[PDB]
């Protein structure tokens, strides 16, 4: 029975282990969408400065 429990624990840990991996594997992917989007906004800010320096159009 000891064996049993120990084995289960190991498997359970592996379960949690994989449950952990996928989790972060998701979070970075989502983060990958965020950062790119952030970059887009950064570009906009830069351009918002450009139009802000064109006095006649501004």
């Amino acid at each position: 029975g000891n064996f049993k429990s120990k084995l289960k624990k190991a498997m359970l840990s592996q379960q949690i282990t994989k449950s952990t991996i996928a989790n972060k594997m998701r979070l970075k992917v989502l983060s990958a969408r965020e950062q790119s989007l952030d970059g887009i906004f950064e570009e906009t800010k830069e351009k918002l400065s450009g139009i802000a320096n064109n006095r006649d159009e501004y």
Binding site: N2, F3, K6, L7, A10
Partner: peptide
């Protein structure tokens, strides 16, 4: 009468020592 061996039959110790060694397969996995 060899009834003393009846007690000596209690070990028989390696019968479970080998079992524990095999159960070490869980630690190996």
């Amino acid at each position: 009468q060899d009834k003393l061996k009846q007690a000596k039959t209690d070990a028989a110790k390696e019968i479970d020592s080998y079992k524990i060694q095999k159960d070490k397969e869980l630690k190996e996995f």
